[PDB]
């Protein structure tokens, strides 16, 4: 009922960063666990999430480069963000909808976490 | 308002109810979410479950009347039912009992279920006009605890686990146990007659080797749905042919189909207007979060509410049509809520579940509250056994269609889900309008035969 979120921070372009979602009343395990996104200025977008049972959904700009997964034991969901690109920044939220579905809006999802930073920047090493 | 013998029922009944669809409200989730299974195993399984639970009602009426006495099968069923809601919770240590579990739950429902209304029956005076009101107030507590069971069973197996919620349906029916042991007194001179005789332990004996043998049987059909069909569909096939061989039973024959038709509707509660609800509905009403499964609880919500008032408001067949035209608006209501009303991510208001259940309510207040007492009334034993047949044929009957709305375990975006189920839906209500249709000719017909 009440998601903790955690892993977020600052990365060049190019890296990595791993965020994790975890429950305490209920056990994540009936719910599907959408992940969510806010830029600076615009509206929460639906990222990733995966359902009750392992079906997986995706926006489109991510595929290729994040995996949502599941850890039943630990009753915790992952967000593995590779190949992370500037316009990846933005605040992520993850939401909890119990069953199946991964609905698109923030509306389909009753239990929020409170949000964690990822900022992407285009640093690279000196040439 | 009423004798004392009255409240020890009424409670017995509630609890007994309460552990009751403490399990059916979450029973389909278990199978797919803790056994595994695709929904469509779980859905018939379920009606599996269902169609054995409801045929061996028929087996505890002649129990109690004839071998063991009313108060002692209510106490032998009660065990037995406490002793399987604890094996369902069992089942999570040892998965491989889980069916043993259910079809001790369908054996000990069978054992009970008769015997708490022909106890009532026997609390007042033979024309004493308080019974009508009783009886109405018993309805009343049946659905009492179902509510509370299928609002509060979900929120409990999410927050503590399926054993705990299993173990607490046990609780239940062991307080059930205990008010009635309680209150022993009240209902001294109130049974059937083999009550007032010593228990005799050969016939004890009897219907426990009996009772086991069927807790083995119904595991095995509920194991093997694909044979359960074929001795449904031998037996029907075979009984109507037996029925036909031997006016005022044409009747009953008719109302009972119509009944069947009835019950392959209101078996789709648990199963796909349950995963309805899950996948298609919004999860929050009046600004709170609710957990889907306990949409069910609009079922039992609106019978309590509406039994009263019905109860304070033709004869038979018309109002068995007017049953059938309510269900087959809720069905509608359903489809046209998927069809018209939803959202663009594929999410519907919970407002239309709301007003599916109440249609759905009110074709049960008018169809079943009223069915048998009135088969009664045109009629014996084999018709009684057909009855029991032929509905428990039904919910089997009503997991197929259940299964035309299986989602597979990978889908995830509700505008996929949403028109499966308004197709089904529509279909459902479509030839259920065209049932009440026919079933509205035949009324004039049909009450000429009453005569
Ligand atoms: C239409 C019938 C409605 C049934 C009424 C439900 C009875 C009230 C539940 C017991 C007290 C509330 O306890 C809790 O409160 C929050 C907000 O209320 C609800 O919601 C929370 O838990 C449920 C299931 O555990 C989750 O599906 C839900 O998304 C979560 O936010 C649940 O209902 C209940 O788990
Ligand atoms: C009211 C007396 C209680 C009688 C219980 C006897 C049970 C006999 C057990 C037979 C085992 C199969
Ligand atoms: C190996 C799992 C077998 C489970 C059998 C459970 C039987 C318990 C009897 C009370
Ligand atoms: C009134 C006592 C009923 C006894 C039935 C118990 C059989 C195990
Ligand atoms: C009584 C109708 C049975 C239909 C089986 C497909």
Same mark, same amino acid.
């Given at each position: 009922?009440?998601?903790?979120?955690?892993?977020?921070?600052?990365?060049?372009?190019?890296?990595?960063?791993?965020?994790?979602?975890?429950?305490?009343?209920?056990?994540?395990?009936?719910?599907?666990?959408?992940?969510?996104?806010?830029?600076?200025?615009?509206?929460?977008?639906?990222?990733?999430?995966?359902?009750?049972?392992?079906?997986?959904?995706?926006?489109?700009?991510?595929?290729?480069?994040?995996?949502?997964?599941?850890?039943?034991?630990?009753?915790?969901?992952?967000?593995?963000?590779?190949?992370?690109?500037?316009?990846?920044?933005?605040?992520?939220?993850?939401?909890?909808?119990?069953?199946?579905?991964?609905?698109?809006?923030?509306?389909?999802?009753?239990?929020?976490?409170?949000?964690?930073?990822?900022?992407?920047?285009?640093?690279?090493?000196?040439? | 308002?009423?004798?004392?013998?009255?409240?020890?029922?009424?409670?017995?009944?509630?609890?007994?109810?309460?552990?009751?669809?403490?399990?059916?409200?979450?029973?389909?989730?278990?199978?797919?979410?803790?056994?595994?299974?695709?929904?469509?195993?779980?859905?018939?399984?379920?009606?599996?479950?269902?169609?054995?639970?409801?045929?061996?009602?028929?087996?505890?009426?002649?129990?109690?009347?004839?071998?063991?006495?009313?108060?002692?099968?209510?106490?032998?069923?009660?065990?037995?039912?406490?002793?399987?809601?604890?094996?369902?919770?069992?089942?999570?240590?040892?998965?491989?009992?889980?069916?043993?579990?259910? %079809?001790?739950?369908?054996?000990?429902?069978?054992?009970?279920?008769?015997?708490?209304?022909?106890?009532?029956?026997?609390?007042?005076?033979?024309?004493?006009?308080?019974?009508?009101?009783?009886?109405?107030?018993?309805?009343?507590?049946?659905?009492?605890?179902?509510?509370?069971?299928?609002?509060?069973?979900?929120?409990?197996?999410?927050?503590?686990?399926?054993?705990?919620?299993?173990?607490?349906?046990?609780?239940?029916?062991?307080?059930?146990?205990?008010?009635?042991?309680?209150?022993?007194?009240?209902?001294?001179?109130?049974? *059937?007659?083999?009550?007032?005789?010593?228990?005799?332990? *050969?016939?004890?004996?009897?219907?426990?080797?009996?009772?086991?043998?069927?807790?083995?049987?119904?595991?095995?059909?509920?194991?093997?749905?694909?044979?359960?069909?074929?001795?449904?569909?031998?037996?029907?096939?075979?009984?109507?042919?037996?029925?036909?061989?031997?006016?005022?039973?044409?009747?009953?024959?008719?109302?009972?189909?119509?009944?069947?038709?009835?019950?392959?509707?209101?078996?789709?509660?648990?199963?796909?207007?349950?995963?309805?609800?899950?996948?298609?509905?919004?999860?929050?009403?009046?600004?709170?979060?609710?957990?889907?499964?306990?949409?069910?609880?609009?079922?039992?919500?609106?019978?309590?509410?509406?039994?009263?008032?019905?109860?304070?408001?033709?004869?038979?067949?018309?109002?068995?049509?007017?049953?059938?035209?309510?269900?087959?608006?809720?069905?509608?209501?359903?489809?046209?809520? %998927?069809?018209?009303?939803?959202?663009?991510? %594929?999410?519907?208001?919970?407002?239309?579940?709301?007003?599916?259940?109440?249609?759905?309510?009110?074709?049960?207040?008018?169809?079943?509250?009223?069915?048998?007492?009135?088969?009664?009334?045109?009629?014996?034993?084999?018709?009684?056994?057909?009855?029991?047949?032929?509905?428990?044929?039904?919910?089997?009957?009503?997991?197929?269609?259940?299964?035309?709305?299986?989602?597979?375990?990978?889908?995830?975006?509700?505008?996929?889900?949403?028109?499966?189920?308004?197709?089904?839906?529509?279909?459902?209500?479509?030839?259920?309008?065209?049932?009440?249709?026919?079933?509205?000719?035949?009324?004039?017909?049909?009450?000429?035969?009453?005569?």
């Amino acid at each position: 009922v009440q998601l903790v979120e955690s892993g977020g921070g600052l990365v060049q372009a190019g890296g990595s960063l791993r965020l994790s979602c975890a429950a305490s009343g209920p056990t994540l395990s009936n719910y599907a666990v959408g992940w969510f996104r806010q830029a600076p200025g615009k509206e929460r977008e639906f990222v990733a999430g995966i359902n009750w049972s392992s079906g997986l959904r995706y926006k489109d700009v991510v595929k290729g480069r994040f995996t949502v997964s599941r850890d039943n034991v630990k009753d915790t969901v992952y967000l593995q963000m590779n190949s992370l690109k500037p316009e990846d920044t933005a605040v992520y939220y993850c939401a909890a909808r119990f069953g199946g579905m991964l609905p698109l809006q923030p509306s389909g999802y009753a239990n929020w976490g409170q949000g964690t930073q990822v900022t992407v920047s285009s640093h690279h090493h000196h040439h | 308002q009423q004798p004392r013998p009255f409240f020890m029922i009424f409670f017995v009944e509630l609890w007994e109810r309460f552990g009751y669809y403490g399990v059916q409200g979450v029973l389909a989730v278990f199978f797919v979410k803790q056994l595994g299974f695709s929904q469509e195993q779980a859905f018939v399984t379920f009606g599996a479950f269902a169609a054995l639970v409801y045929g061996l009602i028929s087996i505890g009426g002649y129990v109690g009347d004839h071998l063991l006495g009313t108060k002692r099968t209510i106490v032998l069923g009660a065990l037995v039912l406490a002793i399987g809601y604890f094996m369902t919770g069992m089942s999570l240590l040892k998965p491989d009992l889980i069916f043993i579990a259910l %079809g001790t739950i369908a054996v000990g429902n069978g054992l009970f279920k008769a015997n708490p209304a022909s106890l009532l029956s026997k609390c007042y005076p033979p024309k004493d006009p308080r019974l009508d009101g009783a009886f109405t107030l018993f309805y009343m507590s049946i659905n009492i605890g179902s509510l509370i069971a299928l609002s509060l069973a979900p929120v409990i197996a999410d927050r503590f686990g399926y054993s705990v919620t299993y173990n607490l349906c046990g609780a239940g029916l062991i307080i059930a146990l205990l008010v009635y042991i309680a209150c022993r007194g009240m209902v001294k001179d109130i049974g *059937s007659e083999p009550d007032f005789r010593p228990m005799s332990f *050969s016939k004890l004996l009897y219907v426990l080797l009996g009772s086991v043998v069927m807790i083995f049987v119904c595991a095995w059909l509920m194991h093997n749905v694909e044979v359960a069909n074929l001795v449904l569909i031998v037996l029907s096939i075979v009984v109507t042919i037996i029925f036909f061989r031997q006016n005022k039973m044409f009747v009953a024959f008719v109302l009972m189909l119509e009944a069947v038709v009835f019950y392959i509707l209101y078996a789709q509660m648990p199963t796909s207007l349950n995963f309805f609800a899950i996948n298609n509905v919004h999860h929050e009403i009046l600004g709170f979060s609710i957990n889907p499964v306990s949409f069910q609880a609009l079922n039992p919500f609106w019978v309590v509410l509406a039994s009263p008032i019905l109860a304070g408001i033709l004869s038979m067949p018309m109002k068995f049509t007017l049953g059938m035209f309510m269900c087959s608006l809720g069905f509608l209501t359903a489809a046209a809520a %998927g069809m018209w009303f939803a959202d663009a991510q %594929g999410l519907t208001s919970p407002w239309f579940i709301v007003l599916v259940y109440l249609f759905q309510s009110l074709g049960e207040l008018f169809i079943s509250a009223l069915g048998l007492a009135m088969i009664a009334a045109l009629v014996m034993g084999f018709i009684l056994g057909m009855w029991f047949l032929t509905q428990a044929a039904a919910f089997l009957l009503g997991g197929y269609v259940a299964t035309f709305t299986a989602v597979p375990d990978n889908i995830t975006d509700p505008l996929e889900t949403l028109p499966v189920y308004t197709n089904v839906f529509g279909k459902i209500g479509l030839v259920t309008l065209g049932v009440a249709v026919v079933m509205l000719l035949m009324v004039p017909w049909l009450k000429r035969m009453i005569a």
